[PDB]
Structure formats: C-alpha cells, structure tokens
Amino acid sequence: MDYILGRYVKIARYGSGGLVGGGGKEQYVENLVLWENIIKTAYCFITPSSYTAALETANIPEKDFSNCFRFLKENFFIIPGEYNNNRYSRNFLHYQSYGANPVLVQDKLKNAKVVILGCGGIGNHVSVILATSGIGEIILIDNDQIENTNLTRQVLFSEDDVGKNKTEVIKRELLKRNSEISVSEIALNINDYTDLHKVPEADIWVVSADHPFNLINWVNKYCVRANQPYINAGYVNDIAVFGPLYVPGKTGCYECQENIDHKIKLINSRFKPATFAPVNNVAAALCAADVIKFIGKYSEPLSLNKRIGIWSDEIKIHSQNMGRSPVCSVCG
Amino acid sequence: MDYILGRYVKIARYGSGGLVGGGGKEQYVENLVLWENIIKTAYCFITPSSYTAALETANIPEKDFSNCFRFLKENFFIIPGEYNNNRYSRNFLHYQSYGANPVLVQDKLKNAKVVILGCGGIGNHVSVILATSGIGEIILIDNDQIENTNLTRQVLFSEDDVGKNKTEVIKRELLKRNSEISVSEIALNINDYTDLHKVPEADIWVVSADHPFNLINWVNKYCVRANQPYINAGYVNDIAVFGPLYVPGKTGCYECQKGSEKENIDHKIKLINSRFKPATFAPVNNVAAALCAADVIKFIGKYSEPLSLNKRIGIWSDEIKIHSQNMGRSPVCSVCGN
Amino acid sequence: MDYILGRYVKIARYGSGGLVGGGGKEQYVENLVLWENIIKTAYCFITPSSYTAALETANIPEKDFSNCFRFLKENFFIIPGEYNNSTENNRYSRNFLHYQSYGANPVLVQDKLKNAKVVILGCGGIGNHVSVILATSGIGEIILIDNDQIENTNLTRQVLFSEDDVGKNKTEVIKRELLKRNSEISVSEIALNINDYTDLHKVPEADIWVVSADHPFNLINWVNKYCVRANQPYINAGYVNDIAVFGPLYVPGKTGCYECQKKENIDHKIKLINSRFKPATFAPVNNVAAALCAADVIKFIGKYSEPLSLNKRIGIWSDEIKIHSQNMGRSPVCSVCG
Amino acid sequence: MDYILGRYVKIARYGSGGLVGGGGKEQYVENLVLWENIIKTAYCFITPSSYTAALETANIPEKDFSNCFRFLKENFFIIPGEYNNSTENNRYSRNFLHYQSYGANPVLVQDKLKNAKVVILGCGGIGNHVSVILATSGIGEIILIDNDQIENTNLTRQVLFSEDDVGKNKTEVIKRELLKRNSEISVSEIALNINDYTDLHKVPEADIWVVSADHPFNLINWVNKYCVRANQPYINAGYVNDIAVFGPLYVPGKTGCYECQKKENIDHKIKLINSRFKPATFAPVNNVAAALCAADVIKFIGKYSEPLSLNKRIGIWSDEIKIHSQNMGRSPVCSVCG
C-alpha cells in the first residue's frame, strides 16, 4: 500500500528540536536529530510512496526510518494513499487528520438525514454548516415568519425576506450554496407532545426550538421511546449551550441527572433572552460539529453525556454531567 | 427617575433559596426570606417606576426594599427606565444586561468604521455580525476570487458566486441584510510591509489574512507605529484562535512575547510548508469568527471588556479545552517599547 | 449603630482575674473587678445592641462601661453589627469569623478575593496545597503553570492527586479538583516550563505569583529579576529539607528583592555534588510552608492583616521547636533593584 | 562496608569558608581549608565506597580525611550504602530521603508504618489533613471515627471533600478519598459520637489516637482519662482561633498527661458567652496544626526522630512570627495519672 503526507502537516524548528503538525495533534520533538529524520521521512511521502520505496529514497538507517514512519503514521501525519483524492476537499483534510477515510465519511454524510427542529438563530447557522458539508437530506421544521429583529443572528435572511416563512428562506438559501442536497420543509409548531409524531425519523434531530419550557422534555421522552438520536443547542443569555447528544442505549438522556407564586410566574412569563449573535453562533457551530462527528463516525462528539456551556464575558467552558442514571424516570 | 425590571431576568426556586438572573450574571441566594424579598421587589418594577412609587406597592419593610433594590440595580436586573425607550432590539437587551444605555452603545457602533482585512471564512462571518449589529462603516479588503471549496465556511457566498471578487460578493450580501450601513472595497494584497499604508485608518482592523507566515508581524509593527487598534482571528487546523486585541498604550502587542541551518534539511522543510493547507472545519472557523466579532463589538461599544485584551485564545474542538497565550505588555518589547 | 460580640471570643477565670479572647489576642486581666466589668459589658452584645441601649443594660457605671466598650471594640471582640451578615449563602461562612477577628468586614474581604487573580507557578507539593486553600477561600481567578505529568511518588504530598491520575498533566488534574471543590471560581492552565529567563514573559500578570518551581537552582533569581522589572508581586515558598520556608513576599517599591541581602580543584567538585541534590521532601514540611504561603497571599489581597513574609524569608524547623526569620529588606547596592 | 553521600546534601561557599548540609543539620565551617577538605571527602563518597576505597581517591592526608569522614557520618551526610537500596520508583521514595537524613534505614521505618494502626478521632479539618498525610506515607491501617455529614461550610479546610459530597458521611468520603490515593493500605470507619466518657470504650486499641474532636469542651478531658487508664497513646491537635496547636503526645509512663499541669450572676454570663463560642477557623492555621501533628505520629511510629510534642502543647501563631510550648510534663501529684 501507498502512503502520503497530509497537507495539514506543518514543520517548525523549535527549542532543542522542532514541531511536527498543527492544532490538537501538534507534536514537540525535543531531539533535533530525530526531528531532522522525521523531516527526511515526510519528504518521501509528499508524493505517494510505499514504505520500501521511501526507505530507499530517505537513505537513513532502517530502524530510524521505521521510527519516523511509525510516528508520522500514528499521528495521521502520513495516511494511506487511498485516503487522498472537489467541493468538500477542505473537509477531507479535516477527516484525514483524525485518521479517517474522507470518502467513507463523505458517503455517510451523503446518506444521512437531519431534522432541524427550530429554524431561528441556531437553525440558520447549523443548517448551512450541514448543507455545505454535504449532509444528503435536511428537513426544516418551524411555523414562524421572518421579522426584522431576526437579522442580527439569522444569517441566511435578508431585509427583503421579512414576512416570509423561515423554512422557505433557509431552503432557498441552502440550495443556492449546495444544490446537490435535498431540502424539505414542514410548517409545524409543536404545541403538545403528540405533535412530535409529525417530525420524521432521521439520523439525528437538531433541537433548538425553545417554547414552551418543557418542549425539551417532550422531545426527550419522545426520542427515548422512538430510539431517535437528538442534540440540544441554544443559549441562556450570554452563555452558549450545546448538548446533550442523546444516543439510544448508549448515553444518558436529558432526564438522567403562595401569593409569591403569581409573582415568580409573572416575572418568568415576561422573560426574553439578552443575547448576542456571537453567543448564538458559538452554540450552533459546536452543535454542527457534534452532528458531523456523530454521523461521520470519525471522532467522538463532545456533548455525549454532557451539556456544555461556553461563557462570553469570561474565558470559560464548562460541562454539566448528563451521564446515564439507572434510576432515570424516562430511560431505563 | 424610573427604574424597570429587565426582560432578560428570570428566577428559579432552588436549593434553600433561589436563583436570580440568567447566564453569567446569575446569582444564587441561599437565604429563602431574602430571595423572596428580591422577587417581591423585582415584581414592583415590572412597570417603569421610581423607587418611591415601586415601594408604595410593596408589602415588605422599607429597609428590605432598599437592600433588594440595591442588589437588583447592582446586577443590572433593574435599569433606568430611559434605557428601555428597532432592528437592534435583541442586542439592546444584551447591552442593558451589562448596565449600559443601549441607545448610546448603538450610536457608537453607528459612528464606527471597521476594516475587514481578509474576506475568507473569518472575514465572512465577522463582517455579517458587524453589519447586522449596525457598525456604520465597513471596509472590505482582499484580492482573491471565490472558489467552490470556499463554500464550506464562507457563508455569504453562493455556488453562482464562484470566480467573483470576495469583496464584491460580501458587499452585496451585507447591504442585502442592512441597507442602513456603508460598505466599500479595496482590491489589495499585502505583499510587503510597505503595502500596509494603503489600508485606511479605522476604529479597528479585523485581521484574518494569513499569507505569508509573517503578515501578522507586519500588521503588528504597522499598527503599533500607526496607533491603529487591531484584532487577529483564525485557526490552527482544529484549534479556533482569536486575539490579541491590540489597543495602543493599553495592551501588549503581538511581539511582546516574541527552516534549518543545515541546507539539506532546510529545503525539505520549505517544500513541506509550501504544500501546507489547514485541516479545518466550519465549526472551528465560526467559533473564532464569532468570538472575534464579540470582541470588536465590545471594544467599540465600551460596555464590557473584550476577552482578547493581552491574550491569544485557542479553543480546542476535539476536547473541552480553552487556553490563553500571554500577550501583556513587555517593557523590553522590540516593537512596542516606544 | 449596632455592635455584636464576635463568636470567636473566649472567656475564662485564670490567676487573679481572667482571660479575654482566644489566640493571638488573648489578654490576661489581673484585676478581677475590671475582668467582671468586661464580661458584663460583653454580655449586652451577644445579641446586637447600640452603645446607649447596652449602657442601660449593664449594671456598671458609665465611666467603667466606656472603658470596657473601647477595650472590646479595639480588640475586635465586639464588631459592627453589619459585619455579622448571618444570611450570606454561604460557601465562605466559616472564614468570616477570621476576618471579623482582625476588625474587617468579611464581605468586603470576600469581594477583594473574588476580584483577584493568582498565578501558581509550579503545581507540585507546594502548588497543590496553596491552590486548594486559595480556591476554597474564593480567590476569583487561579492560573496554573506547569508542564509536568503526575508520578506515583508525587502522592506523598500532592494532595489533589489520586493513583488514578498518574500519567496525566498536573495543571489539568488540579483544575479538575479545584472546580469540584469551588464551582464558583475560574481556573485556567498554561503548559509551560521555564527553560530560561525569557520564558517568564509567557507567565501573565496577576495580583501575585506563588513561586514554588525550583528547577534549575537559579529559577528563583530569574523570577525575581523579571518581577522587579515587571512590577509583579510574588511570594516564594518551599523547603530546605526538613525546614519549611516561605517568603520573601516581594512588593514593588515596598520591600527588598530576593537579591538585596545577597580556587580550581574544588569548583568542579562543588558543582558535581550540588548537581546531584534532591531535597528530603516530607509532607508535614511541605504542608506547613504551603499553608503559611497561602495565608500571606490571602492577607496580601484581603488587606485585613500584615503578611508575615514582607521583607523576610521565614523558616520553620520540623525537628526542633523553632522559627527563624531572615531579613530581606531593601539595599541601595542591589544589582537588581538598587 | 560501603558508604554513600546523601542526595539531600548541598554545599555552598559562604563567609570565610562554607556551609555543609541543608535544613536543620546545615553547618557553617569558618575555616576555608577545612571546608574544602570536607568537600573533597564528600566527593569520594558520591559512588558507594568503603572508607579505604574512598580514601584511595582522596588527594588529602589521611588525618584530614578521617576527620571529614567523621563529620559527614555523624551528620548522616554519608549513610550506609544499603540504605540507598530501594527503587527510585518506590511510592515512598521521597520520604526515604527524609528518613536517611536522620540516620535511619528507610526500609525499616517503612516497615514500622506498614504495621501500624491509627485511629482518627474527628474527621473535620484536622482529621482530613492528618489522615491523608498518614495514608500516603504508608500507615497500614486507618480507622475513621465521626458521626457527622458533610456540609457546604466544610469545604474551606476539609481538603478531601467536594461539593458533590455534601450530605454524605464524613468518614465514608474520607475512606473513599484515602483509598484513591493509596490502595495499598486498610481503612475502616466507625459511626460514633462521643456523648459521654463511657462511649470511649467503643474506640479501638491502636498505636496512637489522633484526637481533634472538640465537643463538648471536656471531651479532651474524657479522652485523656480513658487513655491513661487504657494505656493508650494519643496526640491532640487543633487551634485556638489564629493559633495552630498540636500536642500533647501522651505516651503511658513516658510523658505527662493532659491534666498534669492543669456570685452566680457573672457565672451565668460567663457560661452563655462561652456556650456561644465558635473558633475563627482559617485553613492555613488548621493545616499547620494537622501537618505537625502528622509529623509527630510518623516519628512516634517510625522511631527515627523525637516527636516535638512529647511533654508539650505547642502553639504556632499566624499573625506574628512566633512558636511557643506549654509544659505538660509529668506531675507525681496528678489526679489522673499520678
């Protein structure tokens, strides 16, 4: 078999040796001689080569070459030549760097179906990422119409779209960006649990709809019954939220873990979130990544068994545990 | 003077007492009696009311009312009624929650001019947040045309836009979303340090251009000499990066914390790096662009401290991980020690 | 204005009269009549009372009541009633009596701690112990600096670490454990080993650096040089075998710095012996040094009592009953700060 | 017949001569030539060497060598070669250098600890800190006695406990936490509140009891009387507000016991004031008392150095640099042990 150097591999002289790779998998090789040999080895795989052929070309001791080849291979700095090959080419570099076959990942995305339940801030941003990453079918669910105030966060919408159906404009704008995918709309506000039967089975549901307060509870109980994976995303004012990502039988579910009354109920009935496009976009982006990773199967979604928050007025990411509980009211 | 309960405040009975507020400002008050007083007081300011007028309707001691009033006012859960007097409505709740007068914040955004240096994935997402938040003038700078591969992250672009100038298409799409603002383009590629004088002065530069490796170093040197604020944003493969936000005389600069000697290794390094293409991913791009844009809005708006002052911040995407690189002022810096 | 008796006040019959207070503030009152007058005055303040209301309650002459009131007030045995704040959450409730006993309003001390940043430079034996005291006392932002992984031998004193944690990064496990203990604060990490002086620019500004990193032997001299130049407060803590050491607490422009009071056939032999040095670590010694270090930090930021280690290197013996202090006052002939 | 230089040995040129050793054993040798000779001699024992083998590599007269050998041996700067015969990988290896420096064979000290049993009577701030030190130094059996559950307020000092632990038995969580740190030892619990002297019979025989339970006030008096009658060694530790306190360490027939050196109107006022007493807790003070308590336990059982609190109650101040010992020497007169 042939191997090839990933284009995502950068090399830098640093400290007593140097760096190989960039991002999460960046390696610090302290020993300069080892680092120089890794360079000599990587050089042989810029164009695809078998191990024996590169061994000849590199002209360093076989034991050293074997060391360097192994190091490059384990970190997916060099990859099976078969994994090399296109509109998705940049995403391919991503899948490659996790040690996946991008063609198999792309095929999984192409054959997947994603429900977007809620086509507001989060729906807009999640739906574009998924569509342009080649998710084969996207179903858009909302009964609301576009308003001028939506435009701060709802990136697919224009001034001219005010008054039109949310699902209609998303579908239009999605197809402008990737005409290879199929998009559906369902004009549907979930008023009671039974309405969830109108939401089709899919690989995963992206749930950002937020009214009423126990919508997420209905969705959860429904999806546990239906063996339907879903992921929740949103915000609480300045905090971006994504997760949990519920996987039937594998992860925990959402549930696992008086004249004062009319005053609290009144105050809470008037609540409107004080939030911010950047907050919205962070939640949606990380939600979309967990969806791609879940369907593509190349890396573990972050929000399995977790509800993750990202703060905007300080530097902070924190997770609330949503691990499985054998005493759970809904699952088990 | 009237005060009013912000609509972004919510309350929950919790533990021994309860929670007041949502998000980063949320307060847990363990004492039941005190929590119950804070909500009763909050309730009196649902309609815009002076302290005395609200107190008239309350049925708790005057001294408890004051304590609670003080608590609410300090956390910006109640605000001057004038602050609540529009496309930017949702943004207004945000500003209010930081104790700011949203009309004054909005006017500062209206009077602002922002340079978008680099109109790729970062520049796409930043420019549209800025435009729809009412930044008054935006200047688009790039010399590249759209390619089909751009579409995974460059959210303003359609299939039909392949081959067109990125600046042209961004402008079209921004004015489609906010016709109340001013957008202009400069077809420029920064080739040398000496090209930077061709970039206009602005409230801030959003720098996401990345070619060659030392462009950021030239931008830093120039902006330090020019008294020009800038923010850098981008990614390193799977790591979303924003910062530093350089502010003349206030923060450190990019350089405050600042191939091969063997020829047969050097040329191998150079070829490898010439073939470099980042292994990244819309979610990574979008996180960096979003936090960048938040820092621009806060820097201009003045209502909250931008996160990337004195910091280059990385957000990992395959782990729960955020780390900061120190970019505080060095009194020995070879660029900003004026 | 109400006054209230501190709960930390202790009274006992002793000698010819009695003792008032416990700890550093304990006072032997030989005169029985004045001792009895002190307790009669104190008795009026168990529940909060004004000077005048209490004056009428006491069976003692105005003259004697005045003397006894001032006695109690000046020793902070009675404190302003507002300092009691009985209805605080409270995570930190236990610490309040300590602040009260020094005449401070605990809620104001608590606020200073919440608004502080502390860098822990070195996340070993000393770092474990200091960081946890600081986190649970409510220092608002803690920055963990180290590049080392946990080893089984670390477990004798690196209290936050479990057998299960061997192999993991020290900063990551400390962060995890600190947030399990106090979810209300912020913790961050920097994967960094100071290899030369210039790596110190990678350590951010904070209210104070807690320095227990010890490799190489002159790391402390680099740190000192940097902090003087950077106007950065720091406290050093560690041990010399069986003696626990904390201090100096360097304060820019207030204290001396670390350097202020500073053949042929031998040199190679001296170098060799010293290059082999390993401290005789012993948890009790480590823990004492870390504890008193942490006290000086809390007091430095809290401002309610003088840190012990201002202008001083303090050693506590473990095989003798002994504490000795080494002067580290300013020198005009100092090569670093003179 | 081999000797080896201690790894804990350091030297420095100082004054007219130099320093040898670090910690309590540091010696200043004013004579340059003598100091130089000690270095040359110490150098000869870096590798494990007999007196004769080392002397053959020394470039100094045998009389000078003999005297330097004697100085090094007396101070345990050089130790028997076999005392260094364990793995650097032994979990207790750091403690081993500590034992070496006191002239003990670390394997034998460790054997004594492995076979010891220690009762922890009181699982609050002191018991938390003592128990982990003892667990991770290799005390073979630890018995935890308390009847309280974990509260939010505990977390300031109670280092083994976390927010999630609230509501759980103190002893259950300590056990879990101790075994996570050292799975090579045995840890038991007894749910017991000592309500009267008669309850002390339910506390197991052990090598020593660590006593930090504090309620009622005469609990120490009960413990002392029982232990004297039951021939049971015990150490007391705690605090009196800002003063850390450890001792006495009672050893049947070898030390004094606790009681050795010991209108109705104001009487009732005294009682109510004292009934109201709550210590001004502060983690640094707690941890100091616990650390030195633990040191005394390890030395009592290890037998390599004298526990400090034999015949003494020792106070360490926190707001001044001060350590003081109250005599608790044996009295023939004593009503309890006399």
Ligand SMILES: Nc1ncnc2c1ncn2[C@@H]1O[C@H](COP(=O)(O)OP(=O)(O)OP(=O)(O)O)[C@@H](O)[C@H]1O
């Ligand atoms: N029960 C529900 N069924 C279907 N869609 C829902 C339900 N509840 C909420 N949604 C939709 O989910 C989306 C939530 O997104 P978002 O709140 O950003 O939009 P919005 O409500 O128009 O904006 P704003 O709250 O600022 O007016 C909305 O489009 C809303 O119509």
Ligand SMILES: Nc1ncnc2c1ncn2[C@@H]1O[C@H](COP(=O)(O)OP(=O)(O)OP(=O)(O)O)[C@@H](O)[C@H]1O
């Ligand atoms: N020196 C420079 N001067 C001006 N613009 C620049 C310079 N270097 C880079 N840019 C621009 O900054 C943007 C970088 O964004 P990005 O890399 O996401 O886009 P891209 O290059 O089209 O995509 P890809 O890197 O996937 O090919 C590009 O539009 C590029 O043209």
Ligand SMILES: Nc1ncnc2c1ncn2[C@@H]1O[C@H](COP(=O)(O)OP(=O)(O)OP(=O)(O)O)[C@@H](O)[C@H]1O
């Ligand atoms: N120059 C340096 N930069 C950063 N961290 C350092 C430096 N020198 C020492 N440290 C860190 O400071 C800590 C010192 O603590 P300590 O010596 O108790 O731990 P240790 O070195 O792991 O243990 P031992 O000395 O018993 O092997 C270590 O965690 C070490 O990694």
Ligand SMILES: Nc1ncnc2c1ncn2[C@@H]1O[C@H](COP(=O)(O)OP(=O)(O)OP(=O)(O)O)[C@@H](O)[C@H]1O
């Ligand atoms: N008579 C007794 N019998 C058994 N255990 C006791 C007795 N008296 C006290 N204790 C225990 O000894 C410990 C004393 O330690 P400490 O006072 O630090 O703990 P705490 O009471 O949890 O802390 P705080 O008093 O600050 O709330 C407590 O855990 C307490 O339950």
Ligand SMILES: [Mg+2]
């Ligand atoms: Mg909505």
Ligand SMILES: [Mg+2]
């Ligand atoms: Mg590019």
Ligand SMILES: [Mg+2]
């Ligand atoms: Mg060390």
Ligand SMILES: [Mg+2]
């Ligand atoms: Mg207690």
Ligand SMILES: [Zn+2]
């Ligand atoms: Zn469940």
Ligand SMILES: [Zn+2]
């Ligand atoms: Zn600079």
Ligand SMILES: [Zn+2]
């Ligand atoms: Zn000095």
Ligand SMILES: [Zn+2]
């Ligand atoms: Zn006695």
